[model samples]
Target: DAGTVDFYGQLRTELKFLEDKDPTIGSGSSRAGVDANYTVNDSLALQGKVEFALKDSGDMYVRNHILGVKTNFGKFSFGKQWTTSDDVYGADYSYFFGGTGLRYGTLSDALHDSQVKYVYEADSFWVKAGYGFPEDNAKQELAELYVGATFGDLAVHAGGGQNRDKAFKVGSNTVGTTTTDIKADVTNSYFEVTGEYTIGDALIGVTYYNAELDVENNPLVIDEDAISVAGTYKVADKTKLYAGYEYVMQEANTGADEDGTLVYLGVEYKFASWARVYAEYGYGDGTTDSANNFGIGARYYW
Candidate 1:
C-alpha cells in the first residue's frame, strides 16, 4: 500500500489498418490516466480518476474522470463511472473482438454522468448495481445490475440494464419551419451472461447478450441479439494467443443493414510488469459489408 493514498495508471498508443478503410488510421482506444484511493480510515475511503490525452492531432480530451467513496457497507462512485453491466460485458477472454456490431448490446459507453453505483464483494463473488438520473433535454433513463462469481476453475457472470433513446428531428414544414413535436415513445433493455473455465494454462469462455430498443419513428425496427466465444493459451509465462468468434442475428426494418459474424486471431505479450503489447486481426462478415481489420498496440503502466 502507498499509505493513505495509492496511485496507478496506464498509457497505450496504437494504430490499426482496416482493409475496409485504410490510410485513415484509427486509435485502438488508447489514452493515459491515473487513479487514486485515499483511505479516510479503516472502514472509509475516497477515490478518483482522471484520464485523457490529445485526440487525433489537436484538442485534448478526457475519459473516466470520477470520484467516489468506499465504506464497509459497499463502495459508491460517481462522475462518469462504469455501469454495473460493464462488469460482465467487459469480462472478455479476448482483449479485442473482431466483427461489426456483433455482441453489440454487451459493450458501448457503459459509463455516464449523474450515476449512483454500489459495489459489494465477498470471498468469491461480487455484485455491481447502479442508476443514472436523467439530465435536462435527455431522452433516456438508465440503470444497471451485474453479478459475478468464481468457483474454483470456473467463473460465471451476468448483467442487465435499463435505458431508452431518441434521435434528432429531420422534418420541416413548407414554410421552412418545424411543424411536428419531435418526440417518440422509446424503450431500452439489456442483458448478458458469460461463463469461463480454466484448465492448466488454457482458458475458454462463452457469452450471450441481448439488447432491445423500441421507438415510434418513420422507419426501421431494431433489436440486437448476439453471442460470442473465445479461447486463450499461454504460450509462455509472458505471452498468450487469442482466438474468438462472434455471431449476431439482427432483426430490423426493411433495407436496414445489420452485421452477422466476426472472427479474430491475436497474440499478446507482457514484456514486464509495466509494459505489454498486442496485435490482432479482425474479420467481420455482415449483411451489408465485410471488414478486414488489423492492428498492433503497446501499453505501459506505473
Candidate 2:
C-alpha cells in the first residue's frame, strides 16, 4: 500500500549584514514557508505552499499552489505552476541556498491565473508542454515547450517560449500625452544544455544559457547570457562539500553592456534523511568587492 497524506515545511532564521556595499546596501531579513502534499489515491495528488517574509517589509506571498494528477498514462496539472523554462535548467545546480532552487531570478517568474500542463516520461527521457493565460491585467498570453533526456548520470535539457503582446491605454495627460492608440509588443526566447557526471565521491556539471527579449517590433533587443559550473564532493556519510561559479553578461540593442561573475563555496551536514544544516560564502559582483553570505538553518519533512 502507498502512504497517506504527507506534509513538509521549513523554518529559516538567520542574521546578515552588508557593509561597504554599493547602491545603498546594509539590510537583514528572515523567512519561513510551509509546504503540504496530499495523496488522494495511487495516481492522484494535491499540493499547496505559502511563504512569509518575516523581515524586509514583512509580507506574505504564495510560493506555490498546485493541483496535480499522475498515472501510468501521463501527468496533467493546473493552477499556479512553475514555467517550463525554469524546470529545464533550474535543477542542474545546487549553489543556491534553497535546496530546491527557489530564489530571486534563479528561475523565471511563476505563472499565475490558469495553466494547463502535460508531461510524459518513458525510461530515461521526458517531454513537457504548457500554456498560460494572462494575469495582472497584462496584455500578454504565454506558451512554453521543452524536452529532456537522461542517460546514466548525464542529462540534456532545452526549452523556449513566446509571449503575445496585449493592448492597453496610457495615463491621462494635459498635452494629450495620453496615448490611447499606442501599443507595444514583447517577445522572449531562451535555450540551454546541461550535463552531470559522477566520479567516485564527487559529481560535476556545467550549463550554458542564452536568453533574448524584443519589444514593439522595434530594432531594440535585450540579450542576456550565462554560464555556470558546479561540483559537490561527499566527504562522509553526513557531510559534503560544494562549490560553484557563474558568469553573466547583458547586452542591449542600444549599445549597452555589463558583465558579472559569482563564486560560491559551502558545506552541508545532514543529521538525518530529512534534516540538514548549511553555511555558504558568496563572492563577486553586487557585493562589497566580494561579499560574504553565511547562514545556518535546519529543515523538516513529514
Candidate 3:
C-alpha cells in the first residue's frame, strides 16, 4: 500500500492434432507478473515490473525485469526486458501459431538481456527506441526503433532493427562420446510494416516483413520475405470468428529459393470475461510437401 502494486497472470493451454503426427497438449504463453508504481512528485514517478514464465516445455524463469522512471516527456527503463520491436509485433489474433508463426526473428531480436529503452506516447501516435548491451557471443550490440500512428478507424505501425554477432546453429559434431552443437556467427536485420482497419463489427489487418542474414566467413547470404492477412468478425457478444493466410519466401545467394503458404480458420466462444475456448484448423503447402493441423484450446486469466 505504500506505493501501488498490481498482479496479473494467464494460463493458456492447447491440444493440437497434426495431419500424421500424434496429438499433443502444450502451453501457448503462460506467465505471471507484477507491476508497481510510486509517485515521487507531481511530475515524476518510479515504476518497476517483474514477470515470470510458467512453462511446460522448459524451466520457469524470469521473462522480464525492468525498472523505469516516468516524466512529462516520456518513460525510460533499463534491465532485461523486451526490445522496441516487440511493440509493433504480433498484431493478429491466433491462439496457437497461426499468426505468430510468420515470425522469423530470433529471441534476442524481440527481447534482450540488458536493454535501455525509451517510449513516448501522444493522443494519436507513439514512438519506441531501445539499445542493448553486448550479450555473450556478441560482437555488436542490438538497437531498435518503432513508430505507430492511428487515423480514425485505421492504424499503422512500422519499424526495423539490426542484431549483430548472433550465433546460428549450423550442425553438430560428434567427438569421443560427446556431441556438441556447431554454430556460425551471423548478423540479423529486419523491417516490418502493418496496417489495420476497423469496419463496423469486423477488423482486418495486413503485415509485411523482410529480413536478411549475413554469415561471417561465409560467402552465401540469406534473405526472407513474408506477408500475412487476417481478419476477425464478432458473431455475438460471446463468440467470434477468425481467419488468416500467410506466405513466406526465402532466397539464398547460392541460387536456391524456397517458399511456403499457410491458411487457417478459427472460432472462439467465451463463457466469461476471464475464460474462453477456441478451435482452429490450418493447412500448409511447402516446397517439399503439404501438411495440416487442428487445435482446440482454452485460456484463463486473472
Candidate 4:
C-alpha cells in the first residue's frame, strides 16, 4: 500500500431535544463530526478530523486537526492533539461527560496545539509521552508521561505530569501565575489501576483513579483527589450496558468546600464492526447543582 491513496472516514450525527425542570436549559441541538484516515505505507500514515454543531445557539468548529506519521518504532505527530493525561484515562471511561473535558485542562479533553509525541508498544505493555508548546505568549509548558502493562486479564496503569508556571492576560496586563492560578494551568499527578474478567457471556471491569493538584501559590492551596469505578456488561451480540461512580474530595485553604460524588450510566449498540449508536446520562453534586445530559447518535464508517 505504499504511495497508494487510501481514504477512510466516519460521520457521527445526533439530534437531541431536552426539557429540563429549569427553564434556563431547555433547548434542541444537532451535532456531528467527521474523521478521515489515509494510509501511505506500513510505516507511515496521515490523518485529519473536523467537527460541527448545528441548531440552537450552535456554531461550526473544527474540533480536531492532526497530521502525523506512525510505525512500530514509534509515532511523531503535529497539530492539535489530546494531552498525555487525557489519553491515559479518557480511553477507559464509558461516559461522555464523566471526566472534565480538556476545556479546563482536566482528564478528558486536554487537546493542545503544536505537540510532539512518541509511543512504544511491546507484548503486553505500552508507553506514551508528549509535550505541548505554549499556545500563546505564556511562559509555561505542558508535559506528560504514561506507562501501563497488561498481564492476562489484569492491567495496571500509572502516570505523572507537570505544568510550569505560566502567564495569562488579565484585562490588559500579562501576569505570571502558578499552574493553579489560571484554570487552564494544572499542576497535578495521577495514578490508576484497572482489570477486566470475562465469564461465559459477560465481560466485567473496574478502575480506580487518584489525582492531586498542587495549589501552593494560587488562590486555593487545597488539594483535590478522586476515585472512580466502572463496569460494562454485554446484553447481546451488539448491545451493551454500562455504569460508573466516582467520589471526589476537595479541601481548600480558605475553607471553601469539602467533597462530592458523580454517577454515570450508558448504553451502546453496534450495527457494524466500525459503527455504533450511543447514549449516556450523568448525575453529580460537584457544583451543588444536579446536572443531567442525554444524547443519541449514530456513527458511519467508510
- 49-159: candidate 1 lDDT, tens digit per residue: 777755676566776677788898788888765556654563355555553332323323555556788889898999988887767745246777888999999999888
- Model 1 segments beyond 4 Å from truth? 1-7, 24-28, 96-108, 167-186, 216-220, 253-259
Order the candidates by lDDT, highest first. 3, 1, 2, 4
User: Candidate 2, residues 1-302: lDDT per residue as tens digits?
Assistant: 34344344454444333335332222222334555566677767655544443444455555556666676666777766666655665433443332222121222354434676778899888988878777764624667777878888777766666644444322333555643455545555666666677788888877776767666657878787877788889999998898888776778989988776677778888888766777666666631155555544454433
Off by over 4 Å in 4: 4-8, 15-58, 90-92, 100-104, 138-140, 164-186, 198-200, 215-219, 286-293
Which lDDT values do the candidates have, in the order given?
0.71, 0.60, 0.81, 0.60
Instruction: Write down the lDDT that model 3 would get.
Output: 0.81
Q: Which lDDT value does model 2 have at 255?
A: 90
Query: How accurate locally is residue 247 in candidate 1, as Cα lDDT from 0 to 100?
Result: 82
Question: Total clashing residue pairs per candidate?
Answer: 0, 0, 0, 2
Which residue pairs clash within candidate 3?
A: none
- Give the deviation of candidate 1 from the true structure as CA RMSD: 3.9
Give TM-scores for every candidate, taking all chains together and pairing residue i with residue i: 0.84, 0.74, 0.91, 0.73
Q: Is candidate 1 or candidate 3 better by TM-score?
A: 3
Q: For model 3, how does the per-residue alpha-carbon lDDT over 163-206 read when each residue is reduced to its tens digit?
A: 77556677899999999988887777888888999998898989
Q: For candidate 1, what is the total of clashing residue pairs?
A: 0
